[PDB]
């Protein structure tokens, strides 16, 4: 698709939540495990993403994901309008790697976006270079 | 200078510790507030911004900041090898606008990286993009 839609969703493991933003052009993953599904921890991990991507429109498999205040106020702010499995897959395999389970996420999320014929790193830096 | 030096390190600001990641050749920043100056939330930091972008080798201006094994665990995973005033002036603009300061300081990782001749989270997706 076009080069700033991001798609956001949680996933659950191990009793905590884990919060996953893909680049749909790209197939590039953002990853953090969060204490709980709020509305406020969604807000924040969107600044967090568009202060390092241009992000102009996001997605979710859950709308209701996007109908507190607080995401509201966070997607006002930073301009933003409104393969999950495969990460599953990457963190059961290196789980035994690390006491947390949010050391294992990063590890899934480093193999996933480096995993190449390029890497969804390289994809989306090229992709996002070409826009501009 | 070369397209995977990145610069790490911490800041203090009402009893928090901001710790700060620069692209030395971009000017481009990822940061976070952390609970304390410890070795693990370095380590942790670390695999999370090698599995973003392509992390060659990390200075700092405190040294004694990569002893720790945990650290040398994390780089040694990674693959990683061995400015911070204007953040700081950003957020002390932008301070009122937020509750914590964890987001007045991805506020100010946002205006940062997104002011202009291009900005510094335009460069370094060119950068990157060039180098691949
Ligand atoms: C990363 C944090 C600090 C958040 O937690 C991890 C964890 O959750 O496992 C953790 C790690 C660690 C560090 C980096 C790392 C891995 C594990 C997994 C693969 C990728 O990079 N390490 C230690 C420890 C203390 N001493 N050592 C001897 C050592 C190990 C490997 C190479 C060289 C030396 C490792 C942890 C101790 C307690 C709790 C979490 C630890
Ligand atoms: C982001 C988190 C959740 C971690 O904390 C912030 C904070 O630390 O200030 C917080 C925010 C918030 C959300 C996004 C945001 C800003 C502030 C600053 C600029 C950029 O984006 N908002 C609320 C709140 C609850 N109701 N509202 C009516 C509203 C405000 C603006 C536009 C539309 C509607 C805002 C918070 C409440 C309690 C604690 C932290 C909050």
Known sequence: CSPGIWQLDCTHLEGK????????????????????????????????????????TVHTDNGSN???????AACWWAGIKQMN????????????????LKTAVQMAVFIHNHKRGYSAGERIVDII????
């Open 66 to 72: 996007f109908t507190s205040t607080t995401v509201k």
């Open 17 to 56: 939540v884990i919060l996953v933003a893909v680049h749909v052009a790209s197939g590039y993953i953002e990853a953090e495990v969060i204490p709980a599904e709020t509305g406020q921890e969604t807000a924040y991990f969107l600044l967090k993403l568009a202060g390092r991507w241009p992000v102009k």
């Open 85 to 100: 499995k495969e990460l599953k897959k990457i963190i059961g395999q290196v789980r035994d790697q690390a006491e947390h």
């Open 129 to 132: 270079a070409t826009d501009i």
